[PDB]
Amino acid sequence: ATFEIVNRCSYTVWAAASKGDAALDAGGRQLNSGESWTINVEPGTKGGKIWARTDCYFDDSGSGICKTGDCGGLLRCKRFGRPPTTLAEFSLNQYGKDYIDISNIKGFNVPMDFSPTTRGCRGVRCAADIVGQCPAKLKAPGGGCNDACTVFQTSEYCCTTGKCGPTEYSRFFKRLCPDAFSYVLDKPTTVTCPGSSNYRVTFCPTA
């Protein structure tokens, strides 16, 4: 499957692609404003994620730090990134179908559009100014808007027991982005696509 990752932001982002225990394709790359990076994702990939990292510094060997979405200081991600991270999530070729979504469960850093480039389904988007409107207690100093589980570490926010409800914090993410998961047990906003679809992830799809 092909994923074109486009940075429409006015600032540089460091794209990352992982399935949690391994990089997807190169796993990461710098994207200046307007740049596109095309990756190949193996059919059958389950639990794949793409996100943007901001304010990164890497040396000649691909080791450094990012203010948002840092994946253990590597340019090439093998693991998931440190919150806040808006997430493009996907599971491919799952009994003949692909499943995609955008999640705010790990917070928000960059607005994003996640759409198929092939026929058979619609795209998902979370493009509201979540950072600008972020409740005071969820504001991340490094940038971005943290989810309540990351900040407070409670069974209610983290849905530890699988018995949680919406909260004042999850309702804020849901209000600004109704098409993204706001908490673990949120009503699914997953989009079903034909198996083997191709996609585009656009950072800052509107501005």
UniProtKB/Swiss-Prot annotation:
Disulfide bonds join 9-204, 56-66, 71-77, 121-193, 126-177, 134-145, 149-158, 159-164. Gene3D superfamilies: Thaumatin (2.60.110.10). GO terms for cellular component: cytoplasmic vesicle. InterPro entries: Osmotin/thaumatin-like_sf (IPR037176), Thaumatin (IPR001938), Thaumatin_CS (IPR017949). It is found in: Cytoplasmic vesicle. It holds the Pfam family Thaumatin. Keywords: Cytoplasmic vesicle, Disulfide bond, Signal, Taste-modifying protein. It comes from the Eukaryota. Belongs to the thaumatin family. Taste-modifying protein; intensely sweet-tasting. It is 100000 times sweeter than sucrose on a molar basis. PANTHER family: OS03G0233200 PROTEIN. This is Thaumatin I. It comes from Thaumatococcus daniellii.
